[PDB]
Design a protein around this nucleic acid. Sequence first.
RNA 1: UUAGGCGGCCACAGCGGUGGGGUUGCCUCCCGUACCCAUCCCGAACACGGAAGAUAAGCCCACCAGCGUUCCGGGGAGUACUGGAGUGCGCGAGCCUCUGGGAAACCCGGUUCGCCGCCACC
RNA 2: AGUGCAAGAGCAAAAGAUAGCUUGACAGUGUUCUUCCCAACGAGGAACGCUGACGCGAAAGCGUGGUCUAGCGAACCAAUU
RNA 3: CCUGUCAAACUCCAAACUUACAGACGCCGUUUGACGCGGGGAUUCCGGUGCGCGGGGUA
Lengths: 160, 95, 140, 154, 186
Amino acid sequence: KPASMYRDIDKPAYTRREYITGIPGSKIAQHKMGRKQKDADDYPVQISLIVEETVQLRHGSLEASRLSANRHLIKELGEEGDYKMTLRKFPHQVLRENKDGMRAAFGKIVGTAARVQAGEQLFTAYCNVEDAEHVKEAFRRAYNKITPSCRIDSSPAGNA
Amino acid sequence: PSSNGPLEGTRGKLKNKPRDRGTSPPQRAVEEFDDGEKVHLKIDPSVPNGRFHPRFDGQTGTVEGKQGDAYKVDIVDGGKEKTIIVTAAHLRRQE
Amino acid sequence: FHEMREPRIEKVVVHMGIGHANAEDILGEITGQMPVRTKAKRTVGEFDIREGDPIGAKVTLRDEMAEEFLQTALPLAELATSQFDDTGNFSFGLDVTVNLVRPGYRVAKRDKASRSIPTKHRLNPADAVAFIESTYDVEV
Amino acid sequence: MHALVQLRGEVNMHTDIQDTLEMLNIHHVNHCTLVPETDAYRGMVAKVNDFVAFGEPSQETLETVLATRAEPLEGDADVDDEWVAEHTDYDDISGLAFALLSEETTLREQGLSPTLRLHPPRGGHDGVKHPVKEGGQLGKHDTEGIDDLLEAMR
Amino acid sequence: ATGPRYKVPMRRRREARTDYHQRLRLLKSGKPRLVARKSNKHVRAQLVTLGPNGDDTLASAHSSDLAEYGWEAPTGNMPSAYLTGLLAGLRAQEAGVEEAVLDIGLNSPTPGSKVFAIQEGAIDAGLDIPHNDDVLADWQRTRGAHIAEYDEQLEEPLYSGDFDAADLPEHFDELRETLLDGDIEL
RNA sequence: UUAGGCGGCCACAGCGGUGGGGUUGCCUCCCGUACCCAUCCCGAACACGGAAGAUAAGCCCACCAGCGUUCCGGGGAGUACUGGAGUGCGCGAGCCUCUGGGAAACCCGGUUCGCCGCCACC
RNA sequence: AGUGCAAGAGCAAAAGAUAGCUUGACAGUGUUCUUCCCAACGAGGAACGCUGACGCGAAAGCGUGGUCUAGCGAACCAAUU
RNA sequence: CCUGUCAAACUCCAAACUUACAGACGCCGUUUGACGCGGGGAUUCCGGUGCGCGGGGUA
Ligand SMILES: [Cl-]
Ligand SMILES: [Cl-]
Ligand SMILES: [Mg+2]
Ligand SMILES: [Mg+2]
Ligand SMILES: [Mg+2]
Ligand SMILES: [Mg+2]
Ligand SMILES: [Mg+2]
Ligand SMILES: [Mg+2]
Ligand SMILES: [Mg+2]
Ligand code: NA
Ligand code: NA
Ligand code: NA
Ligand code: NA
Ligand code: NA
Ligand SMILES: [Sr+2]
Ligand SMILES: [Sr+2]
Ligand SMILES: [Sr+2]
Ligand SMILES: [Sr+2]
Ligand SMILES: [Sr+2]
Ligand SMILES: [Sr+2]
Ligand SMILES: [Sr+2]
């Protein structure tokens, strides 16, 4: 199913699990990557991937962008490299599909997505000055798998 | 509305803010009003009886007499004049 | 300062928690006054589905009745530190509970302007072990 | 005292907004009225802000417009110093202009129509699709701005 | 106290001094209330009316100011209670009050009690108060007889301070005799 | 108000804590069951009767802010949101300008450890 | 928590629990609102009165069924008082 | 303790705004009689579009 079908916030918030059943499981494998035993404060560099437009990101997209990003970090820094990345959003919005013409059209449940306002940080990484360009590259690959244009913003980092 | 009973859609207006929860002070349930007096109508969630139809919450009527211990208050619902039977507990003097 | 702070016995409650009574008779002799039926709450698999129904009996003693009982009941037990409340109460044994408190305990038992007894005026396990131990027996 | 001039017609304007103008005695495009600066009147102009041009005019400007567009409560009789003197509590237009600006009287009080029926603006106005700050002619004007408008519509 | 949503009882409820449910029912009469109260040593009767910023006491009598008319006996018994009511009642009549409803606060409606004695007193004073005769102690007890006979089982004076040995309900009579009299400075 | 009773508002009054106060005065704790009355058993309570003792509870007085609450300053914020207007921008979801309104969280500093009414009373 | 049953709402010296007593789940007749916002429309419903007769309570007072909003039915005809 | 997120059928908070009544100003009415009341006659009970707010639906 194309994202054009759900990328916009054109419907009420639909998240009440007490009134919604049959919600598919999330495809997101992890929200905290790298050395999660360590704190984000122990790093000199913090870089976030900022969304430029308000949108809904299906869990299938979060998994792919997160995957293609962390995967790069693992290849360039190792299965235990000194870094840590976080996906701060969770797919709370339940999605439907009307799959009988327009009669009794309320759709059956088919997935979940996370609503992201423009300007918000979807991902945030923490690394050493060395692996700074490796994270900027992991993000370049990640925003290629999510609807909106993004800004790769570097927070703590005056080592330019 | 899905139904049309008297309490349809009255969740908020007939619910007490947590701190005003519990038996209400007797003073206002015994207050006396005179004919001609302007009184705001507002049901007190804690008081069961002596209520008027929730649709009238927020009206500012005029006392024109009483029936037993309740008051007969005149209001104008839209363009129509109506007499409401209501006890002091759900009334407040205007101003 | 001490006369109104030195402990005392509010009540001695003797009770036999059975489960279906005929035992009321012995409590009436060992204490000196009539016992009371004991009803239960909630249904229980152990053929105890009847909400209200005899299941036990107790006798609350106060004043002399209380002491005259402990003078022959206390020697029948081996009191210990753990066997005491956090309020300064203890029960041994047929159960035998001793409720100890300070003078003006009425402040929390009267109808008008009742009030909760301040923690400072609340008896303590230590202050309790003393009082009792300081009267015909030993502690732990 | 602010001078109000309707610059946008009634078609498609909210009814409550249109009734407000009428209460302010303006029933046509280009019609002008003088309103005291009270809290009550303030709400009214604020509500009609998008279909009018308003501001405080200079004594000289008010005088020019009164001479050229003031009218009796009834009749075609001209309104000049002599008319003013023979009909109002003032000796000439100036006395009237000053009393109006200082809000001591109203056109009606002096037997004059509450409305000044102005002429279209000579050389056109700045447009009715934008406010003053954006280069348009709508909303609150400068005394010099209101004067430029009122004079072009003398 | 716990948080924003916590509900604290009305002050007079915390203090355990006002039964608001009984109060409301009391006020529904539209009549003044004969507030009967007690202390370990004294008894007080007040005629209260409703007001804008709180209740208004129109008249009242304390057992203490009973001596003010020739009372040398204790002030926490039946005779004292009755007379205290009557005194308050008389004063009530003075201020224009003609009827009332017995408000016994958090006291118990025990038959023959003092709050009921206060009521019998206030009623004889001329005040119209809804009551029930067979809930009022019999005359003699009001006089204080029950205490005289208790002193009969002497061996040791009932009263420490010397007011008398065998006590006197006849004193009760003298005082009521003095109160029902016109002269009396109220 | 050198301690009381009935209240109104119903946490600005809650929670917790410190200090002070009573020979025939007040409230109590307190002493005591012949009576009225009382405990499905207990004068515990309720009720009655009373002063040997006490200020340790309660209560009243003075006060502390750690928690909770009220209001206020400064910051967040004229932000978020928004009534009216636009041949303003954007592929579009949407955004912007002008006009009139305008938060919430949170942080820092203050306020708040009740206010008021009637009656009685060294 | 409990309060018969949906949901939302009400309730703590109670509207919950226990005990005891009781039959107001009563008769007559209205006011008002609702049904049907505004704005006419029946049955049905509710709140609030007056009259009669009662229950309980010291008494104020409470009881026109169950804390509130669902549990309902024209004319003709029959049976019944 | 710290750290990451939410709600059409959540709310310790809380707008703009809508709304009852009243006063003030404005406007209007007392020969153009308003407001209100009684009576005669209808037509009408397929609507549509823009804008704002929506709910359904990939649209
Ligand atoms: Cl109604
Ligand atoms: Cl009392
Ligand atoms: Mg709502
Ligand atoms: Mg003319
Ligand atoms: Mg142009
Ligand atoms: Mg002390
Ligand atoms: Mg375009
Ligand atoms: Mg048929
Ligand atoms: Mg039949
Ligand atoms: Na079909
Ligand atoms: Na309440
Ligand atoms: Na039993
Ligand atoms: Na003390
Ligand atoms: Na009907
Ligand atoms: Sr939609
Ligand atoms: Sr993209
Ligand atoms: Sr005792
Ligand atoms: Sr497109
Ligand atoms: Sr402002
Ligand atoms: Sr009911
Ligand atoms: Sr609305």
